[PDB]
Amino acid sequence: IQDSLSSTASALGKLQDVVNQNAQALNTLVKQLSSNFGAISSVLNDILSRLDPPEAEVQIDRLITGRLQSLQTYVTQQLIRAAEIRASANLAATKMSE
């Protein structure tokens, strides 16, 4: 078993997949900050620096809606994944105890 662990790399795929999934979810959430969502620009500072409040508010609201939706999606996915990991942890605890 020591030799197998030293040689083969796909042994810990179960943990590597969890790490990769979390990293990819964070990367997608971060990349979602670069979307116009229909606004003139994807940069809040640029929007604020070009229009008066009454006109800026529309673009700001578009960006707010888009980013709120992105956060909600990310949090729901995280909740489901956390439930799966909790099931795995319960199985691991039972395996330890028995």
Binding site: I40, S49, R50, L51, D52, E55
Partner: protein, 49 residues
């Protein structure tokens, strides 16, 4: 039908004077507010007459 296009680049533009000039009956800005024009940098400006 033969509108003339002029190039404006490599200079400092003081839009405050233009905005304050009452001689202009209509002064409408779409992608940028008039007031903020004094605190922005543009790659190049096209003036069509």
């Amino acid at each position: 039908y033969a509108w003339n296009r002029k190039r404006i680049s490599n200079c400092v533009a003081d839009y405050s004077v233009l905005y304050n000039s009452a001689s202009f009956s209509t002064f409408k800005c779409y992608g940028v507010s008039p007031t903020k024009l004094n605190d922005l940098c543009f790659t190049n400006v096209y003036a069509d007459s």
